Amino acid sequence: FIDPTQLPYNEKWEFPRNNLQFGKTLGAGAFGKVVEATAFGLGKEDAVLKVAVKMLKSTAHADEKEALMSELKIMSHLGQHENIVNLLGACTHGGPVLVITEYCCYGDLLNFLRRKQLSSRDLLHFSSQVAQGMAFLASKNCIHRDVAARNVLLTNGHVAKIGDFGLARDIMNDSNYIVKGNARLPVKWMAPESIFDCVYTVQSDVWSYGILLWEIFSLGLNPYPGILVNSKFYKLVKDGYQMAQPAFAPKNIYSIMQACWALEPTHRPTFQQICSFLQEQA
Ligand SMILES: COc1ccc(COc2ccc(Cn3cnc4cc(C(=O)N5CC6(COC6)C5)cnc43)cc2OC)cn1
């Protein structure tokens, strides 16, 4: 509404890089990595917290530095919310850019479902918490563009947080990211208007959230099982093909996924409508 995506960075986030003790790496991409670390004296409470630090790798420059900066500026304007991976601080002077975020000890939702015991209440909680996080991003005018279980983290209490590995995801070597022109795109998660027109809105995040609901209630099957991404798959999604209901999905949840897969983006529900319906279902 009142703010576009052009604001500079808020120095209030700055944290002294010498109070960071790096630990194990948590994941890496072509130009970025995410490392565990301990922050020594972070915030008002002077905590010594385990954190995750996003940073560029040995080999990058130019737009890569900018893209991390842009990631940092984007997160500094969201603010804090329980159901996202929140920014805690950053080091932008005296060295390479470091983006300090919450550490989610249980890892990503997808491997959690695959490692699994769960319950029907546990899947509805995951679905609702992700929906709250997406509603918060929506209300900030922020288009996620990679909504999927591999980008949802579980932290203490097995509370779900939506985030994005961004530069720290090895996209070049992940078959879920399809070669399409000069881009690697998570086609199986993507709204048709976004695959074809490269149109990305809140409503296209809603489609991807429906795919994410299917992942949750299948306990982490790959979407469109057995169906390879090619021209025929594109014709299927455009013609209105929808995956069948997951075995553990109550009919009410499946109806949410179908509403999310409306071919007309205005006919999908908003994230707040999904929160309220998930809310009543409890
Ligand atoms: C909508 O816009 C937004 C919103 C938010 C964001 C920021 O998102 C992120 C920021 C930082 C990280 C890094 N990050 C933190 N905790 C993590 C735990 C693991 C793990 O695998 N774990 C825990 C373990 C126990 O052994 C170690 C196994 C991996 N990486 C971890 C991940 C992010 O997103 C998923 C971006 N864009």
From Swiss-Prot:
Changing residue 170 to V: Constitutive kinase activity. Loss of inhibition by imatinib. Induction: Up-regulated by glucocorticoids. Expressed in bone marrow and in differentiated blood mononuclear cells. Autophosphorylated in response to CSF1 or IL34 binding. Ubiquitinated. Becomes rapidly polyubiquitinated after autophosphorylation, leading to its degradation. Residues 20-278 form the Protein kinase domain. Residues 164-186 are annotated as: Activation loop. Tyrosine-protein kinase that acts as a cell-surface receptor for CSF1 and IL34 and plays an essential role in the regulation of survival, proliferation and differentiation of hematopoietic precursor cells, especially mononuclear phagocytes, such as macrophages and monocytes. Promotes the release of pro-inflammatory chemokines in response to IL34 and CSF1, and thereby plays an important role in innate immunity and in inflammatory processes. ATP binds at residues 26-34, 54. Interacts with INPPL1/SHIP2 and THOC5. Monomer. Homodimer. Interacts with CSF1 and IL34. Interaction with dimeric CSF1 or IL34 leads to receptor homodimerization. Interacts (tyrosine phosphorylated) with PLCG2 (via SH2 domain). Interacts (tyrosine phosphorylated) with PIK3R1 (via SH2 domain). Interacts (tyrosine phosphorylated) with FYN, YES1 and SRC (via SH2 domain). Interacts (tyrosine phosphorylated) with CBL, GRB2 and SLA2. Belongs to the protein kinase superfamily. Tyr protein kinase family. CSF-1/PDGF receptor subfamily. This is Macrophage colony-stimulating factor 1 receptor. The chain holds residues 563 to 914 of 972 of the full protein. Changing residue 150 to H: In HDLS1; impairs autophosphorylation upon stimulation with CSF1. It is linked to Aberrant expression of CSF1 or CSF1R can promote cancer cell proliferation, invasion and formation of metastases. Overexpression of CSF1 or CSF1R is observed in a significant percentage of breast, ovarian, prostate, and endometrial cancers. Aberrant expression of CSF1 or CSF1R may play a role in inflammatory diseases, such as rheumatoid arthritis, glomerulonephritis, atherosclerosis, and allograft rejection. Changing residue 243 to T: In HDLS1; impairs autophosphorylation upon stimulation with CSF1. Changing residue 71 to K: In HDLS1; impairs autophosphorylation upon stimulation with CSF1. The juxtamembrane domain functions as autoinhibitory region. Phosphorylation of tyrosine residues in this region leads to a conformation change and activation of the kinase. Coiled coil: none annotated. The modification Phosphotyrosine is found at residue 177. The active site is at 146 (proton acceptor). It is found in: Cell membrane. It comes from the Eukaryota. The gene is CSF1R.
